[PDB]
Amino acid sequence: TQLDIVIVLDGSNSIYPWDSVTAFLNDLLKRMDIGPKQTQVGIVQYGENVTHEFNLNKYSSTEEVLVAAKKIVQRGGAQTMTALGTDTARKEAFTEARGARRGVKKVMVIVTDGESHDNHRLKKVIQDCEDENIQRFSIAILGSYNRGNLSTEKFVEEIKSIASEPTEKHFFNVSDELALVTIVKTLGERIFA
Ligand SMILES: [Mg+2]
């Protein structure tokens, strides 16, 4: 079965350098066969609000997706609304109106480097994602936290709660931005296999 993939990117300013995120997107995407009858990719960026960078059916080829992924700019933000960004991907990104197809497996990839301001909604948002059979891969970047000498225990536990089970398979603990690209092959093959 094919796959509708929606990448949800935290765009907060603490994430640096943005080139690491786009390099991560490029590497993950270039090894996919994007098409209306193949894999479809949609990308959403969130900070304090949410923005659909491009819908699931916006681009019909891998080359096109790559071009669009490289153009994504960091929108910034002072408070991380992960619940909002995730719920929106479920509510809007994954809709026929934006390209989502029938009889296709839905996959969400969440990338963030901080604890969410609306973490009180995560329980509900996630459960709704589960009821809709959306497989979730969450990635926590401990870069800004470590550099700020902040405790990452709760943060890791929170992003982990977003991941689908097993968990050790859907959750990725990334030490820093430059290390993002090192999970591409594993994540890549897991999204599919
Ligand atoms: Mg942040």
Curated annotation (Swiss-Prot):
Glycans are attached at residues 49, 149, 173. Residues 1-192 form the VWFA domain. It is found in: Membrane. It comes from the Eukaryota. Belongs to the integrin alpha chain family. Integrin alpha-1/beta-1 is a receptor for laminin and collagen. It recognizes the proline-hydroxylated sequence G-F-P-G-E-R in collagen. Involved in anchorage-dependent, negative regulation of EGF-stimulated cell growth. The integrin I-domain (insert) is a VWFA domain. Integrins with I-domains do not undergo protease cleavage. Heterodimer of an alpha and a beta subunit. Alpha-1 associates with beta-1. Interacts with RAB21. Interacts (via cytoplasmic domain) with PTPN2; activates PTPN2 phosphatase activity towards EGFR and negatively regulates EGF signaling. This is Integrin alpha-1. It comes from Homo sapiens.
